[PDB]
Structures are given as structure tokens and as C-alpha cells.
């Protein structure tokens, strides 16, 4: 009746300062379908972010993929903000670039 989203942030290639890459925000296991997402650069919304079409996996929970081209820097921090009716406040997960 109401499931909390799992948020995982990662890039397509191991990061290299000054090298173009792709950042991904993968949101899963949530319900209801309605949900809001944004990828942030230094806390400021990133203009162009493609949002894959909503889906649901076998346990019936919804999942979705957001992504955007980007070029990491020693001074820039990236994050993914999610607003869902299952949470009191929006959850923002930062990209941990050294994992």
C-alpha cells in the first residue's frame, strides 16, 4: 500500500576528473507509482536529465532510471533528490565517487 524507494547513484565509467561521463539515479521498490526526481549539481537542479519510462518488477513495486551526461571535478558534488508519498521529507542521496 506504500513502499519506500531505494536510491542508488552511480556513473557509467570509473570517474576521472575532467572526463565526460554519465551519472545515473536508479530508484526502486517504491509504491505508489507517483514520484518526483531530480539530479543535483552543487545543490542546483541539473536542467537536462532523461527519465526512463516507469516500470514494475515481479514483486509489483515500481522502479525508474534517471541519467545525465556530466564531467566530474575535484570540486563538484552530485546528488539525486526523491520525493515520494512514503516519506515525510524528500530523500537526497549523494554520489559517493570513491566506492
Amino acid at each position: 500500500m506504500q513502499k519506500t524507494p531505494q536510491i542508488q547513484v552511480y556513473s557509467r565509467h570509473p570517474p576521472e576528473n575532467g572526463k565526460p561521463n554519465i551519472l545515473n539515479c536508479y530508484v526502486t521498490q517504491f509504491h505508489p507509482p507517483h514520484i518526483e526526481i531530480q539530479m543535483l549539481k552543487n545543490g542546483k537542479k541539473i536542467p537536462k536529465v532523461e527519465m526512463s519510462d516507469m516500470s514494475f518488477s515481479k514483486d509489483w513495486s515500481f522502479y525508474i532510471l534517471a541519467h545525465t551526461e556530466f564531467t566530474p571535478t575535484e570540486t563538484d558534488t552530485y546528488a539525486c533528490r526523491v520525493k515520494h508519498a512514503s516519506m515525510a521529507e524528500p530523500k537526497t542521496v549523494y554520489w559517493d565517487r570513491d566506492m
Binding site: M1, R12, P14, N24, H31, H34, D53, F56, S61
Partner: protein, 273 residues
């Protein structure tokens, strides 16, 4: 094996307008078609280059099938309110997943035709494609009705008929991407933790298809209870990635090895820090 599956969702919007109805099609994990009732001109659409070559008749009939389904879903959304004695002011969801898993010889391995209301199982066609499983009392009503109308017979004709046949056609037209195999590029990272140990994380990147085995081993043994993983994650380009980690004692990293198996790997890789 391979699979052809359709994921459908209908979300009622009392106070706004008609229910948001949606259909998505996949052959294994690649979405290849889609239907969105909210779109300016609602009609089935290609989501993979290899389906685009299907003629206008293929697209017109699929668009016609999707609209019939939308109507059916609008209707079922009202029935539900009644079955669960719910108010007509709240928003509700109805999901449907149908598809078939098939082996190389084209023999149906597993067929699916199931529903969920507001996120919980409602009714599902059993593996025998002959009987139904109702999650609750409301679903029984539905089960008894479908049992009487002989619904499972007709639905079984699709899973064994069109699902299977069209699946081989798709796998054929799209073999270049659908049957491709990209080996995983792997590596391991190092992090000294505050508990005074080290976490070793083994990454497997840009591989395809999804199936993969990432494992940590010590003294030729699988550390099945000590591993922390993350389910295989997707990427815009169709490839997948993943990581498995384990915490190890100071100065003992060289005792641990990462083991990764994949279709694109003639032999399992074995990495270290």
C-alpha cells in the same frame, strides 16, 4: 532462455480525469515498445531500433489492442471500488503482467498472466495455465467469474500461441543487440573503515546480458554470509553493472580474491587488490 513480457499499469485520477493507462513491452530486459494514455496522440511506439522496421499494420493493431485494454482497465477500476467498498475520491492502481519464458527449441517454459490491486496480488494464472489463484475474497468473485467464462483457456492460447511465436521473430530481427554479449570490465577498490578494518569492493561494469556472478573468496571458499551486494543496476546504453564487498582485517587483503563469471568470460576472472 528468453522472455517476452508486457507490463501494464492503470492509475485512477479522481478529480483530474481518466485513469493514466500504460503498457511496456520487453524481450528479456530490453524495453522495445510502449503505450502511454497521456501522450498527445496515444499509439503504440518503438523503444528499440530493431522493432521500428515493423509495418504500419503491426503498429495500428497494437495501438488498437492497447486501447481495448485501457477501456477494460477503466472498468475494472470501478468494479474494485465496489469489491473493496472504497470511496470514489481516492486514487488506485491496477497492474497486469503477462508473458512467456521460452527455451531455444521454442518450447514454452513458463507463462504468466497476473494482476495486482493497489500493489498487492489480486489474481494470477497458475503455472498450469488452467487454474487461478485469488489473493483474497474480492479476487474470488473474479476467479469464479473467469472460471465460468472459461477465461484461462483463451489466455493460455496467447501465452502458448502468439507470445512464443512473436518472441522468436523479435529475437531474430534484433539478434544484433538482444543476443549480443559484452564481457564485464572489473576492478576492486579499497577503503579503511573506522571500526579498524577494510572494505574491499569488487566492481563489474558495462556487461551484457544481466546474468552475472560476483563473489568474494578466501582460502578457496565462498564468503556467502559476509558479502554485501547491490542488485544488478541498469544504464542508458543497455549494459549493466554491480558490486560485491566484504570487510577484511588489516594487512590481510592479499588473502581475498574476487571471482566473476559471465557469458562473455571464457573462464571466470579472479581479481585482487
Amino acid at each position: 532462455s528468453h522472455s517476452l513480457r508486457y507490463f501494464v499499469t492503470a492509475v485512477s485520477r479522481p478529480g483530474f480525469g481518466e485513469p493514466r493507462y500504460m503498457e511496456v513491452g520487453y524481450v528479456d530486459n530490453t524495453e522495445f515498445v510502449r503505450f502511454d494514455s497521456d501522450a498527445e496522440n496515444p499509439r503504440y511506439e518503438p523503444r528499440a531500433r530493431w522493432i521500428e522496421q515493423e509495418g504500419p499494420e503491426y503498429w495500428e493493431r497494437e495501438t488498437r489492442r492497447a486501447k481495448g485494454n485501457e477501456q477494460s482497465f477503466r472498468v475494472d477500476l470501478r468494479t474494485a471500488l465496489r469489491y473493496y467498498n472504497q470511496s470514489a475520491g481516492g486514487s488506485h492502481t491496477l497492474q497486469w503482467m503477462a508473458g512467456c519464458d521460452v527455451e531455444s527449441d521454442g518450447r514454452l517454459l513458463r507463462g504468466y498472466w497476473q494482476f495486482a490491486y493497489d500493489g498487492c496480488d489480486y489474481i494470477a494464472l497458475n503455472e498450469d495455465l488452467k487454474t487461478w489463484t485469488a489473493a483474497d475474497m474480492a479476487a474470488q468473485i473474479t476467479r469464479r467469474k473467469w472460471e465460468q467464462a472459461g477465461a484461462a483457456e483463451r489466455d493460455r492460447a496467447y501465452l502458448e500461441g502468439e507470445c512464443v511465436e512473436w518472441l522468436r521473430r523479435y529475437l531474430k530481427n534484433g539478434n544484433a543487440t538482444l543476443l549480443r554479449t559484452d564481457p564485464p570490465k572489473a576492478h576492486v577498490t579499497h577503503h579503511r573503515r573506522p571500526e579498524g578494518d577494510v572494505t574491499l569492493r569488487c566492481w563489474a561494469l558495462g556487461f551484457y546480458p544481466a546474468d552475472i556472478t560476483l563473489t568474494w573468496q578466501l582460502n578457496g571458499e565462498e564468503l556467502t554470509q559476509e558479502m554485501e551486494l547491490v542488485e544488478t543496476r541498469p544504464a542508458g546504453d543497455g549494459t549493466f553493472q554491480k558490486w560485491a564487498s566484504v570487510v577484511v582485517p588489516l594487512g590481510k587483503e592479499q588473502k581475498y580474491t574476487c571471482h566473476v563469471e559471465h557469458e562473455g568470460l571464457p573462464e571466470p576472472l579472479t581479481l585482487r587488490w
